[PDB]
Amino acid sequence: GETTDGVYRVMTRRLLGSTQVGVGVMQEGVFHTMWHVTKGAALRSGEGRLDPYWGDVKQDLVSYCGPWKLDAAWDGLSEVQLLAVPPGERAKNIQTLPGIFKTKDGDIGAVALDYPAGTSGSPILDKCGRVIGLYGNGVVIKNGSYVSAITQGKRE
Amino acid sequence: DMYIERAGDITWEKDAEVTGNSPRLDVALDESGDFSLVE
Numbered sequence: 001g002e003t004t005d006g007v008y009r010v011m012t013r014r015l016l017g018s019t020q021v022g023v024g025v026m027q028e029g030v031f032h033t034m035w036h037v038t039k040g041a042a043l044r045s046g047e048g049r050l051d052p053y054w055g056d057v058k059q060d061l062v063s064y065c066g067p068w069k070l071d072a073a074w075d076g077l078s079e080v081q082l083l084a085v086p087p088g089e090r091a092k093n094i095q096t097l098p099g100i101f102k103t104k105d106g107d108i109g110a111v112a113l114d115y116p117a118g119t120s121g122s123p124i125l126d127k128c129g130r131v132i133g134l135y136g137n138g139v140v141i142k143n144g145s146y147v148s149a150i151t152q153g154k155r156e
Numbered sequence: 157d158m159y160i161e162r163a164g165d166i167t168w169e170k171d172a173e174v175t176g177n178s179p180r181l182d183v184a185l186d187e188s189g190d191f192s193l194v195e
């Protein structure tokens with residue numbers, strides 16, 4: 001399969017035509033997406049097969065072909081870019097200053113941007129081009145607007 | 157069977173479009189990976 005680094009669409013033909021269910025990141029030979037996009041199923045790339053390697057329903061993350069590779073963190077100060085890949089539309093950078101999710105287990109960066117559900121797993125980057133996490137898990141607020149965490153996995 | 161298609165390189169792009177606010181939200185995270193607003 002195609003193992004070039006970068007951002008990929010995740011598609012299914014199990015529905016009408018070809019439907020984009022989400023997005024993910026190829027880095028160091030490993031495919032990274034949100035658990036809720038694949039539910040941990042295998043993926044095709046050409047006639048290549050990607051098997052799940054690691055997942056966590058609570059983190060809502062999954063890796064294919066090896067361990068989670070993405071270890072950059074939001075600085076807590078500086079703007080970030082959501083590299084949004086919406087269904088049937090080109091990759092588009094959207095620059096924003098994250099808010100905070102406050103939890104009993106600590107503070108998490110969060111982005112207040114509203115994109116189709118099929119954008120689930122698009123990467124959030126820092127000024128140096130590093131993936132600080134994945135968009136598409138969060139919350140609907142008083143306004144009926146969507147705020148996503150900056151969801152990041154642990155590297156061993 | 158789900159399949160993947162390459163959509164782009166991962167780069168910072170200068171003069172992107174700039175939008176969204178920065179809310180401070182009290183949230184809880186359940187065992188099913190669902191976040192919710194605490195009030």
Ligand SMILES: CS(=O)(=O)c1ccc(N2CCNCC2)cc1NC(=O)c1cccc2ncccc12
Nearest residue numbers: 036060115116117118120136137146188189190
């Ligand atoms: C509808 S979905 O297939 O994308 C989906 C399925 C499942 C989940 N899960 C449920 C259990 N495990 C944790 C999370 C989340 C999602 N994402 C969303 O619903 C969504 C993603 C982006 C943006 C949004 N904006 C507004 C509302 C919603 C969204």
